[PDB]
Amino acid sequence: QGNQINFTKLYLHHTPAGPEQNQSAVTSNDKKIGLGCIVVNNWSVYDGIGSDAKLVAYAKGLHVFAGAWHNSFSLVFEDERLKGSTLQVMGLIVEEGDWAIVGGTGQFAMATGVILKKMQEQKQYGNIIELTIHGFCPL
Amino acid sequence: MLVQGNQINFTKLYLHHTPAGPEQNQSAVTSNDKKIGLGCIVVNNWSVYDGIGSDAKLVAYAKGLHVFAGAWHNSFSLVFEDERLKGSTLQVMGLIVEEGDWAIVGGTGQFAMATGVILKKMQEQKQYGNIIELTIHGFCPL
Amino acid sequence: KLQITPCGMLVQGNQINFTKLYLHHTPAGPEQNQSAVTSNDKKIGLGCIVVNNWSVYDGIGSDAKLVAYAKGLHVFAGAWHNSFSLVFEDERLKGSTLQVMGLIVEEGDWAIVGGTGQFAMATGVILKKMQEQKQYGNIIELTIHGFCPLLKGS
Ligand SMILES: [Ca+2]
Ligand SMILES: [Cl-]
Ligand SMILES: [Cl-]
Ligand SMILES: [Cl-]
Ligand SMILES: [Cl-]
Ligand SMILES: [Cl-]
C-alpha cells in the first residue's frame, strides 16, 4: 500500500578522465546536428565523503547527448543490506537537477520516486554528486 | 490503500520528428547490421510545439535515443521549456515513433513519479520529417 | 492544453497475471537475433552496446506459439544493462507492450517500468531463470509479477 525509502545521502563518482575513469564515449556528436555522443558509465556510489567512505552501489548504464545528457541506468547495490536489489533510474543531466526512479528490483520492486542531484565536490578528473533519494514501494 | 494524486491530461502537443533536411533534429550514430537487419541507433532532440500553425510556441524537447530492433524502441526525457513547467520532465519509453503509444515511466519536478501513456498520431507528413500529435494521459502521486 | 485533475490511485488495482514465458537470447548462429554496434573501450572495460530483437514463446515444445518480442538494447557497463519493449503479438493483446529495464540477460530480475494498451501504467518485475543453453544461444524462463493501477475519485 505504501512504504517510503530509507537512505542517507549517497555520493556518486562521475569520472570522465584520469586514471580512475569510469565511463567512456562510444560515439561522437554529429558536428552538423550538435548531438549523438553516447557515453557508457559504471559510476561508483559511496555512503559518504573521504577515505573512510564505503562503496555501496554502482550506476551502470549510459547517457546520450541530445543537447543535454539523457541517462538510463541500473543502480545496483553492493552493500550487504541491499545486495540483490536495484533501482532503475532515467532522466536528464548528470551533475545537477533530478532523475526519475522508474522501477526497481529485489527489495525495491515497483519503486517510484526521484533522485535529486547536487554538486558536492569538483575534482581535477571528475566530480562527486550528492544524491538524495525520495520515493516509495508498494508492500 | 489509495494514493492521493492528480490525473494529468495534455492534449494538442505536436512533436517535430525530423530525420533529414535543414531542420534535422536527430542523428544516426550507428547503422543497421547488414546480416541481422537491426542495430541503427539514433540520438534525437525533437521539438514539441503547442500547435500546428504559424504561431505555435515550442513547449518541450524530447531528448533521448531510439534504436532499430526490427521496430524503433525509444527512451527519452520530455523536458518542458515553459518558465512555468521549467525543468520538469516526463520520462518516456516504448515502441514506434509516429503511431501507437509510449509509456510514461516516471517524471521529475511538477511531474515527479508520473505514470501513464503518450498516444501518437501522425498529423502532417512532410519532405524531411513529419509532425506527430501527442496526447498525454498520466497520474502523479502527491 | 494541460489538465490537472485530483484523482485516487490504487496500485493493486489489477494484477498482471501471466503464465511462464520463454525468451530466446541468440547472439550467434543462423537465428542470431541481436547485434553489437559499439565496441568496449579496452582502457575502461565498458562501452559495448548490443541491439536485440529477442523472440518470446509461451512454451518450450515445438507447438509453442510465439507471443512477444523483446525489442531494445543492452549496454555493457561492467554488467549488461537492458532497456526494451516487450511487444505482444496475439489479438486483444495486440499493440500492448510492457516496458522493461534492468541488469543481466540470463539470471536475476528486471523491472517493469511501464506499459501501453492493456498494460498502461504497469509496475512490477520480471524474474529470469535459465531454461536451456543451446549451441548458438540460450532460452530464458520469464516470470512476470506486477500490477496495473486503477484510477478513482474526481
Ligand atoms: Ca515507472
Ligand atoms: Cl559525462
Ligand atoms: Cl546536461
Ligand atoms: Cl542503417
Ligand atoms: Cl517502428
Ligand atoms: Cl551481465
Numbering used by the authors:
A (entry chain C): 17 to 155
B (entry chain A): 14 to 155
C (entry chain B): 6 to 159
Paper text:
A protein involved in resistance against different pathogen groups, which is only present in monocot plants, is referred to as monocot chimeric jacalin (MCJ). As its name suggests, it is a fusion of two proteins, a jacalin-related lectin (JRL) and a dirigent protein (DIR) at the N-terminus. Therefore, the development of disease resistant plants is mandatory. It was shown that the rice (Oryza sativa) protein OsJAC1 enhances resistance against different bacterial and fungal plant pathogens in rice, barley, and wheat. Here, we report crystal structures for both individual domains and the complex of galactobiose with the DIR domain, which revealed a new carbohydrate binding motif for DIR proteins.
The isolated DIR domain of OsJAC1 presents as a trimer in the asymmetric unit of both crystal forms, featuring C3-symmetry with the same mode of interaction among constituent chains. All OsJAC1 DIR protomers show the canonical eight-stranded antiparallel β-barrel fold known from structurally characterized homologs. The length of the traced chain differs significantly between the molecules of the DIR trimers, particularly in the N-terminal regions. These show signs of enhanced dynamics, exhibiting different degrees of disorder in the crystal structures. Consequently, the average pairwise Cα RMS distance between chains, amounting to 0.79 and 0.90 Å for DIR-cf1 and -cf2, respectively, reduces to 0.45 and 0.39 Å if residues preceding Leu26 or following Cys153 are omitted. In either model, chain B has the highest amino acid sequence coverage. Interestingly, residues Lys6–Thr10 were found hydrogen-bonded to Gln20–Thr24 of an adjacent chain (chain A in cf1) in the same trimer, adding an extra antiparallel strand to the neighboring β-barrel. Similar to the JRL domain dimer, the DIR domain trimer is categorized as a stable assembly by PISA; the solvent-accessible surface buried at the binary interfaces amounts to approximately 900 Å2 per subunit, increasing to above 1400 Å2 if the swapped β-strand is considered. The OsJAC1-DIR domain revealed an eight-stranded antiparallel β-barrel fold with a wide-open putative binding area, which is surrounded by five loops.
